[PDB]
Design a protein around this ligand. Structure first.
Ligand code: MG
Ligand code: MG
Ligand code: MG
Ligand code: MG
Ligand code: MG
Ligand code: MG
Lengths: 185, 441, 131, 262, 70, 58
RNA sequence: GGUGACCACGGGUGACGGGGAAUCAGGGUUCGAUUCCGGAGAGGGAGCCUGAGAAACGGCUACCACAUCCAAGGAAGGCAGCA
RNA sequence: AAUGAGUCCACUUUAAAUCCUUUAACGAGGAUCCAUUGGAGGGCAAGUCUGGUGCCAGCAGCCGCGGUAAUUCCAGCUCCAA
RNA sequence: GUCUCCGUAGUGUAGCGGUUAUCACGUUCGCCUAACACGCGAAAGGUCCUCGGUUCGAAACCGGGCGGAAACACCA
C-alpha cells in the first residue's frame, strides 16, 4: 500500500522511581546550570550516554583482536573525539565508561555560545539561538541541542542577517527610530 | 430563468384541497396517466372513489384509510413562466399545527371554499376553519391570496352564477376586516371532481366572463388558476442578509445519511461551508444540496431545499430548529424575547401565568408571560396607560416571553419571515403579532 | 540583481535526449528564492543560448536563506524540447496547453458510452443531454 | 494466487538493485528473459540509477523507444529487459560500451569497456545434449542455445562467444588452477583461482577458490564461472580487480583517499 | 443496564454532587473502579464507576466546564 | 432503598463562594525551571529553623 | 493392516502462519487483524464456460438468506475495492 | 534592544495547489500573544495556613480521614510533580 | 407527523364542579446516650405536568401543549 516509513524511536527514558529527593535535585542542578527547558532533555542526554555505555560495555566483554571489537572500537572512539567529549589521547574503551553527562551537555550549542562569550548568560544563549541570531560555519542554526564538533567549534559566530553581525536592525529599533523622527522636525 | 416561490392550497375541512391541486398537477403534466389510473383502481378497491385525485398528494396510508389529509405534501410542476412549488395542508381543526408549518414556509396561498349546499354553510361558522385559515395566512408572511369557488356542480342548479357571485362577496366581506383587498385578490370558479377550467376555458360556463386584479405593479386578467399563478408578484429576496433556515422535516436516506429539508428565506446556501443549529448547538458542514431530487450549487431565498449534513444523527436535529452559517452570526437560544401582539378572541381574561402555545418558523411550543410590560392601542404603537393588570379581547400589548423549552427567534425588525408568528389556545388563534426585541443566550 | 550569482555542478551531457544535465545552486543572500525566469535567462547567458529552451525545476531553499538548489535542463533545440519533456514544464513555459475537463467527468462519459452499443450517433451523443 | 505475478514491491526487490524506500511502492519487475529476475538489472534502473541519464520512468521510456540501447548486439525496446551478467550494453550514439559485471560487494557496477572488446562475450555452458539426427546442442547460462559445438566442451565450462554471429570463437575448460568469478551467494563477485573441486554425489559440488591476496573461500559449483585461462582473465576486470577486503581496510582506504583529497 | 448483553450492574458516582447531575434513563459510560473487578474501599460489591452521562463528562459538569444539554 | 439520597451535594452547596484572587502570570518553561533552580540552590539563609520545607506555615 | 502415555484420537482457541512488536542483567513472559512473503475468502454452499493460467465471483448456472424495479407478464443483484 | 505566533506581498514547491523553506509591510510590558493536568498524612515531592461541613457530605488504588479545633472532605492561599 | 395511556406532597399515591387530604414512609423536629442503638413527641411537605376555555367557581368537564410509556408510518 502506502510508501511511508514509520521508523521512529524514543530519545529518552523516564526514571523507574518517581519522587526521589536526591535525583530531583541532581537533575535540577543540571537543568539550571545548562539552561534546559524541562527534564526530558536531561533524560535524553542521559539516554544517549547509556546507549554509548551499553555499546562500549558489550565491546569490552568481546574478546580482544576480534575484528568487530577492533572495527567498532575505533568507530565509536572516532566520533567521541570528533564531537569533543573524549580527549584525543584518551582513546581506550575503558575511558568511555568513565564519561558523564556534563561533558555531553557542555558540547551543546547553547553552552558553547555562552562559553564563547557571544551570549551574556546560558539563558540568554537559548533565546539568542532560538531567535535565529547565531550561525555555525555558513549555516544559521536555531536549535540549542545542536552538538558541535571540534572542527565546527571555531566557526560559531553571529548570522549576517541578525542585528549583531551585519546591518538590518530589528523592528523595535526601527519603530523607535521612526517615532523619534516623527516627534520632531 | 425561473423564479423560486411557494404556493399553499388551504381551505375548509374536507373541502377537496388535495383533490383540486391533484387535478392541477395532472393537467399541467406533473405525473403521467397510468399512475393515476393505478390510483383509481386502488381507490375504488377500498371504497372512496372520489379521492383518486387527492391520492397523488395524500401518500400516507392512514390518510387514505381515514380519508383525511394529516401531513404536508410537497410536489413539483412547471408553469409556462417560471418554476412553481406547491404544498398540501390538512386544513383540519386537530392538525392546526401542521398547516402552520407549511404556511410559514409559503409565499402565496390559495383559499378554496365549496359552493355546495351545506358544505359552505358549514365553512362559515364559529367552528369554520376558513376564517382562521385566512388570519393564519396573514400572520405567517403570506401577502398574495387567490380565492377559488370549488364544486359548482354539487350545488343546485349546476352553474347558477348568482351563487358564485354571493359566496365571493361573503369571503370578501371577511377579508375587508382581515386586511386584504378584494381588488388585489383574485376570484375564480373551479371544480374539484368535475374537472373544468384549469388549463382551458370551460364550455359549460358561458356565464363566467373573466376575473381582473389591479395592483400597484400593474393589471392582470385571466380565466383559470394558471393565469393568476403566472401573474402573481415575485417577492423580495434579501440574499445579502445572513442565512437562516427553519427545520421543516428531517429524513434518513440510505446511503447519504441525514437530510434536513427546509425553506431558505435569507442568504444563499451552498455545499462546502459549516452551519450551526440553534436549539441543539451542533456545528456541522453541509454535504450536498438537493430539491425535488435535483442537484444544486446555490440555494436562493425562497427555496424549499433538502441539504445534506455529515456526522449528525437523526435525533440530534429535529424539526423546528434554525440552521445558519457559522461564519456569519449563528442563531442562539433565546431565554426571553419582547414581542407585541393583539388579541383576536377570548371569552376570559389574560393575567400573569397564562400559557398559550407560540408558533413560529415551523416551531410550536408553549410559552409563559413573565410580566405584562405595557398595553398599547390597536395601531401605530401609541402609549396610552401604564401599569398593565389584565388583558381582554381587541387590544395590543408588549410582553416579555420566557419559554421553558429551548427555542430560537429573530426580531421582526431584521428578519420579516422569522418575526411573523402566531399565538393560540383553545384551538383558536388568540394573539397575532411580531417580535421586536430578543435576548441572546 | 545586484548580488545574485548562479553556480552549476554535476554537469554532464547526454545526447540520449540531446541535452546537457546539471544541478544548479543559486545564491540569493538577502533575497527571496529567485524566480525561475531569472535563473533561466542567466543560465542561458552562461551557456550562450536563447532563454526559451532552458528548463529548470526542483528549487529548494536552504534553511536561513542564501543557497537554493535546483535542477537544470538545457537542450540543443526547441524542437527536441517539445519532443522529450514532461508536459507540465512545457505548460509552465506556455508551449503546451491542457485545456481539458476533470477526470471525474471523463470516467462518467466512458461509463455512459459503455451503456450504448455500436451506434456511433448515440455513442457520440451519449454526453449531449446529460451535460 | 490464480496466475502469474506481474508486480514487484519495492521492498521485495533484490538488494543489489540498490533501490530506496520513498520514491514509490513498486519495483521495475523485470520481464522474462535470458537471466533470472533476482540476478538481473532491468534497463530502467541501469539508465536511471546507474548512469542518471533518465530521471523518471517515462524518461527512460523515451530513450528506449528511440533505439540507441543495444544489448548483446541487438536493440531492445523493453523498458524492463533483464540485462544479466557480462552482457554488453552498447549505446552507439554516445560511444560508450558497458560489460555488466559484479563489483567486489556482489553488486553490478558500471564497467566502461572499449568498442573492440565489446565484440565478444563469455558464456557458461549449463547443459550439453544431442538433438534429433544426432546434432549436439549447447545451452549457456543465458537462454542462448547453439548447435554443432566443439566436442571438448563439457558442462560448466566457458565459451568465447562473439556477437552478431553467435558462433563459438574459443572456449575455456573447467580445470584446477583456472581463474574464475563467483556468481552467487556470500562470495559473489570475488575473482580467484580454482584450488580444489570436492564433489558430493546426489548433492551440489563445493569448490575452493584462492584469490590474489591468498584468501581462500568456498562456494557451490553453480556459482562458478571461469573467466580466465589459469591466471590471465579474458575480460577487463572492474575496479578493485574482484578482490574482497574486510571492514578493516576500506575504512583506512577512505581516510587515505580523504586525506589525499583534503 | 448495559446496552450490550443487557446486564444490570451497580456503578458508583465518584464526586460530591454528581448524583444530582444524574437523572433517570440516561446513557452513562461506566468504567472499572480500579482493581480489576474487585470492590474498592468501603463500598461493598461495587466494582464500577460512572465516567460520562448524556455523552458529557462528569468531570466537566463537576468543574462547570460545560453544562447539561437543557 | 433507604431514600437517603436527598443530601447529595450538601457540603459543596453550603461552602461559601470566595473568588480566586487575581495574580501575576506564572513563568512557564525554562524560566519556571530558572526560578525554582535559583530559589532552592543559589541562596544562603542565615536564619535557623532546621531546614524547614518549601511550604512553611510559620 | 496403520496410529497411540515420546499423548494418538477427540474437544477448545477471544488461532490465518512467518519476517517481526512490547518488556529488557542473564534466562524468559506476552503480542503479532495490520503495509513484506505464503495461504484463504468474496452473503452461505455447490457446479461450470473461456483461457497458458480461475472451481474466477467489479464471469456464468442452481439452491438457501436477504434485497431492487414492475404496467405484476417479467427483469436485475453481491462495497471482507476507493469514498 | 531581540524575536517568532499571528495578518499578509511575492517567490518557491506542485500535474495544479497546500504545507515547509526563502523574503517584503505590519506584529509584545499584565510582552492579558494570560499552560495545563493531577496532588500536598504515609507509600510519594509538597502546608501540622485560613474559612466552611460535622461519621453528614464526601475523600480514600492500600493503610486510613470525617461524629464541632479535619495536616486527608468542600474552597481560598501557598507549595509539589511532569 | 398520526394516535393511545399515564402524570397529584419527595416517594406510596385518595379525592367531591364547591375539601390537596390521609397514609407506610422520606425529612425537620423535641426524645436519651461521648457517640450510638433502641424506643417516646409533633410538624412541615400540593400551581393536582403546564397553559387556558366552560362554569357562579374545575385538579378533576373539555381543549391544548410538555414529559414518560406504547404503537403506526416518515426516503432530497
Ligand atoms: Mg479466527
Ligand atoms: Mg499476521
Ligand atoms: Mg478466492
Ligand atoms: Mg490466451
Ligand atoms: Mg466463486
Ligand atoms: Mg486542600
Amino acid at each position: 500500500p502506502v510508501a511511508r516509513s514509520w521508523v521512529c524511536r524514543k530519545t529518552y527514558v523516564t526514571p523507574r522511581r518517581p519522587f526521589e529527593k536526591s535525583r530531583l535535585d541532581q537533575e535540577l542542578k543540571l537543568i539550571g546550570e545548562y539552561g534546559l527547558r524541562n527534564k526530558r532533555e536531561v533524560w535524553r542526554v542521559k539516554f544517549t550516554l547509556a546507549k554509548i555505555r551499553k555499546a562500549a560495555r558489550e565491546l569490552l566483554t568481546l574478546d580482544e583482536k576480534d575484528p568487530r571489537r577492533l572495527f567498532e572500537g575505533n568507530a565509536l572512539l572516532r566520533r567521541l573525539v570528533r564531537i569533543g567529549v573524549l580527549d584525543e589521547g584518551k582513546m581506550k574503551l575503558d575511558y568511555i565508561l568513565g564519561l558523564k553527562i556534563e561533558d555531553f551537555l557542555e558540547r551543546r550549542l547553547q553552552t558553547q555560545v555562552f562559553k564563547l562569550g557571544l551570549a551574556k548568560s546560558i539563558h540568554h544563549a537559548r533565546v539568542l539561538i532560538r531567535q535565529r541570531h547565531i550561525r555555525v560555519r555558513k549555516q544559521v542554526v536555531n536549535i540549542p541541542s545542536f552538538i558541535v564538533r571540534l572542527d565546527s567549534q571555531k566557526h560559531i559566530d553571529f548570522s549576517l542577517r541578525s542585528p549583531y553581525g551585519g546591518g538590518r536592525p530589528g523592528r523595535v529599533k526601527r519603530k523607535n527610530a521612526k517615532k523619534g523622527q516623527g516627534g520632531a522636525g | 430563468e425561473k423564479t423560486h416561490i411557494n404556493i399553499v392550497v388551504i381551505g375548509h375541512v374536507d373541502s377537496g384541497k388535495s383533490t383540486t391541486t391533484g387535478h392541477l398537477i395532472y393537467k399541467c403534466g406533473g405525473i403521467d396517466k397510468r399512475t393515476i389510473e393505478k390510483f383509481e383502481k386502488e381507490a375504488a378497491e377500498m371504497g372512496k372513489g372520489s379521492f383518486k385525485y387527492a391520492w397523488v398528494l395524500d401518500k400516507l396510508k392512514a390518510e387514505r384509510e381515514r380519508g383525511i389529509t394529516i401531513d404536508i405534501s410537497l410536489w413539483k410542476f412547471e408553469t409556462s413562466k417560471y418554476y412553481v412549488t406547491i404544498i398540501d395542508a390538512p386544513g383540519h381543526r386537530d392538525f392546526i399545527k401542521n398547516m402552520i408549518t407549511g404556511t410559514s414556509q409559503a409565499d402565496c396561498a390559495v383559499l378554496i371554499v365549496a359552493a355546495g349546499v351545506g358544505e359552505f354553510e358549514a365553512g362559515i361558522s364559529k367552528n369554520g376553519q376558513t376564517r382562521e385559515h385566512a388570519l393564519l395566512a396573514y400572520t405567517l408572511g403570506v401577502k398574495q391570496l387567490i380565492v377559488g369557488v370549488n364544486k359548482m356542480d354539487s350545488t343546485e342548479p349546476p352553474y347558477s352564477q348568482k351563487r358564485y357571485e354571493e359566496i365571493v362577496k361573503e369571503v370578501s366581506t371577511y377579508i375587508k376586516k382581515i386586511g386584504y383587498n378584494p381588488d388585489t385578490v383574485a376570484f375564480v370558479p373551479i371544480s374539484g371532481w368535475n374537472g373544468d377550467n384549469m388549463l382551458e376555458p370551460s364550455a359549460n360556463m358561458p356565464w363566467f366572463k373573466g376575473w381582473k386584479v389591479t395592483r400597484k405593479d400593474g393589471n392582470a386578467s385571466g380565466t383559470t388558476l394558471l393565469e393568476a399563478l403566472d401573474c402573481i408578484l415575485p417577492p423580495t429576496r434579501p440574499t445579502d442578509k445572513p442565512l437562516r433556515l427553519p427545520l421543516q422535516d428531517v429524513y434518513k436516506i440510505g446511503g447519504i445519511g441525514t437530510v434536513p429539508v427546509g425553506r431558505v428565506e435569507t442568504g444563499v446556501l451552498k455545499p462546502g461551508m459549516v452551519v450551526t443549529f440553534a436549539p441543539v448547538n451542533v456545528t456541522t458542514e453541509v454535504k450536498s444540496v438537493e430539491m425535488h431530487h435535483e442537484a444544486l450549487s446555490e440555494a436562493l431565498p425562497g427555496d424549499n431545499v433538502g441539504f445534506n449534513v455529515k456526522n449528525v444523527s437523526v435525533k440530534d436535529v429535529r424539526r423546528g430548529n434554525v440552521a445558519g452559517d457559522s461564519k456569519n452570526d449563528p442563531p442562539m437560544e433565546a431565554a426571553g424575547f419582547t414581542a407585541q401582539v393583539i388579541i383576536l378572541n377570548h371569552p376570559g381574561q389574560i393575567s400573569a401565568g397564562y400559557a398559550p402555545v407560540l408558533d413560529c418558523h415551523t416551531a410550536h411550543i408553549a410559552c409563559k408571560f413573565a410580566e405584562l410590560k405595557e398595553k398599547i392601542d390597536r395601531r401605530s404603537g401609541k402609549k396610552l396607560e401604564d401599569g398593565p393588570k389584565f388583558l381582554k379581547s381587541g387590544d395590543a400589548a408588549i410582553v416579555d416571553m420566557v419559554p421553558g423549552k429551548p427555542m430560537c427567534v429573530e426580531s421582526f425588525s431584521d428578519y420579516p419571515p422569522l418575526g411573523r408568528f402566531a399565538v393560540r389556545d383553545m384551538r383558536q388563534t388568540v394573539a397575532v403579532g411580531v417580535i421586536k426585541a430578543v435576548d441572546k443566550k | 540583481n545586484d548580488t545574485v550569482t548562479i553556480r552549476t555542478r554535476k554537469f554532464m551531457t547526454n545526447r540520449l535526449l540531446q541535452r546537457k544535465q546539471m544541478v544548479i545552486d543559486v545564491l540569493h543572500p538577502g533575497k527571496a528564492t529567485v524566480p525561475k525566469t531569472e535563473i533561466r535567462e542567466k543560465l542561458a547567458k552562461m551557456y550562450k543560448t536563447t532563454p526559451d529552451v532552458i528548463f529548470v525545476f526542483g528549487f529548494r531553499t536552504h534553511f536561513g536563506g542564501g543557497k537554493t538548489t535546483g535542477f537544470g535542463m538545457i537542450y540543443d533545440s526547441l524542437d527536441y524540447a517539445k519532443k522529450n519533456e514532461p508536459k507540465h514544464r512545457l505548460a509552465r513555459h506556455g508551449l503546451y496547453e491542457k485545456k481539458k475537463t476533470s477526470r471525474k467527468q471523463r470516467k462518467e462519459r466512458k461509463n455512459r458510452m459503455k451503456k450504448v452499443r455500436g451506434t456511433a450517433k448515440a455513442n457520440v451523443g451519449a454526453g449531449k443531454k446529460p451535460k | 494466487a490464480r496466475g502469474p505475478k506481474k508486480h514487484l514491491k519495492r521492498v521485495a526487490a533484490p538488494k543489489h538493485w540498490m533501490l530506496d524506500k520513498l520514491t514509490g511502492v513498486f519495483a521495475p519487475r523485470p520481464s522474462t528473459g535470458p537471466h533470472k529476475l533476482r540476478e538481473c538489472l532491468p534497463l530502467i534502473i541501469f539508465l536511471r540509477n546507474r548512469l542518471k541519464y533518465a530521471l523518471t520512468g517515462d524518461e527512460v521510456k523515451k530513450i528506449c523507444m528511440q533505439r540507441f540501447i543495444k544489448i548483446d548486439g541487438k536493440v531492445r525496446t523493453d523498458i524492463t529487459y533483464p540485462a544479466g551478467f557480462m552482457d554488453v550494453i552498447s549505446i552507439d550514439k554516445t560511444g560508450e560500451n558497458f560489460r555488466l559485471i559484479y563489483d567486489t560487494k556482489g553488486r553490478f557496477a558500471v564497467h566502461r569497456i572499449t568498442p573492440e572488446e565489446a565484440k565478444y562475450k563469455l558464456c557458461k555452458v549449463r547443459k550439453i545434449f544431442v538433438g534429433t539426427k544426432g546434432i549436439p546442442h549447447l545451452v549457456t547460462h543465458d537462454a542462448r542455445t547453439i548447435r554443432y559445438p566443439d566436442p571438448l566442451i563439457k558442462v560448466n565450462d566457458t565459451i568465447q562467444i562473439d556477437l552478431e554471429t553467435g558462433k563459438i570463437t574459443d572456449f575455456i575448460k573447467f580445470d584446477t588452477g583456472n581463474l574464475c568469478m563467483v556468481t552467487g551467494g556470500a562470495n559473489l563477485g570475488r575473482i580467484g583461482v580454482i584450488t580444489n573441486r570436492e564433489r558430493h554425489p546426489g548433492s551440489f559440488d563445493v569448490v575452493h577458490v584462492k584469490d590474489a591476496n591468498g584468501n581462500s573461500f568456498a562456494t557451490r559449483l553453480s556459482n562458478i564461472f571461469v573467466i580466465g585461462k589459469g591466471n590471465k582473465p579474458w575480460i577487463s576486470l572492474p575496479r578493485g580487480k574482484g578482490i574482497r577486503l574486510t571492514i578493516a581496510e576500506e575504512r583506512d582506504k577512505r581516510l587515505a583517499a580523504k586525506q589525499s583529497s583534503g | 443496564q448495559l446496552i450490550k448483553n443487557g446486564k444490570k450492574i451497580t456503578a458508583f458516582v465518584p464526586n460530591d454532587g454528581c448524583l444530582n447531575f444524574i437523572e433517570e434513563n440516561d446513557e452513562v459510560l461506566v468504567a472499572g473502579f480500579g482493581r480489576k473487578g474487585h470492590a474498592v474501599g468501603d463500598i461493598p460489591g461495587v466494582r464500577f464507576k460512572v465516567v460520562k452521562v448524556a455523552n458529557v463528562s462528569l468531570l466537566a459538569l463537576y468543574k462547570g466546564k460545560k453544562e447539561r444539554p437543557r | 432503598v433507604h431514600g437517603s439520597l436527598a443530601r447529595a451535594g450538601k457540603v459543596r452547596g453550603q461552602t461559601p463562594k470566595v473568588a480566586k484572587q487575581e495574580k501575576k502570570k506564572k513563568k512557564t518553561g525554562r524560566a519556571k525551571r530558572r526560578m525554582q533552580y535559583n530559589r532552592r540552590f543559589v541562596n544562603v539563609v542565615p536564619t535557623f529553623g532546621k531546614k524547614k520545607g518549601p511550604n512553611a506555615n510559620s
